[PDB]
Design a protein around this ligand. Structure first.
Ligand SMILES: [Cl-]
Ligand SMILES: [Cl-]
Ligand SMILES: [Cl-]
Length: 129
């Protein structure tokens, strides 16, 4: 599913991501924009052989099981395929664990490089929320 910008903002808020660990909704929408362009089915293979999955490009080295990332963990206790669903519940619950892991949203290199320090509220501007 490719979400609309405000549609995704609403779904994220519905699932309790708004201001989670102090990160405003615009931060999460911005991260999703640059990680997946709002496409739940996004996947990307990393140099280390792990894969990133879903709207927030969650990585199989630590967070989910895909059966093909040697030496990895599955800390969210989910198949990576669950992160590709039109229903963002699994991605949101896993993101909550990731952002609580110590480095906040810096876990998403794209957030650090493209969202951090910017006017992230622009991402939810105009949205009925
Ligand atoms: Cl915001
Ligand atoms: Cl594996
Ligand atoms: Cl980047």
């Amino acid at each position: 599913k490719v979400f609309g910008r405000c549609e995704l903002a609403a779904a994220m808020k519905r699932h309790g991501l708004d201001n989670y660990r102090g990160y405003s909704l615009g931060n999460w929408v911005c991260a999703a924009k640059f990680e997946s362009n709002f496409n739940t089915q996004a996947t990307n293979r990393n140099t280390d052989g792990s894969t990133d999955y879903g709207i927030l490009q969650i990585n199989s080295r630590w967070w989910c099981n895909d059966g093909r990332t040697p030496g990895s963990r599955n800390l969210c206790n989910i198949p990576c395929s669950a992160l590709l669903s039109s229903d963002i519940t699994a991605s949101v619950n896993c993101a909550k664990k990731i952002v609580s892991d110590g480095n906040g949203m810096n876990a998403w290199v794209a957030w650090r490089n493209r969202c951090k320090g910017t006017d992230v509220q622009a991402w939810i501007r105009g949205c009925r929320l």
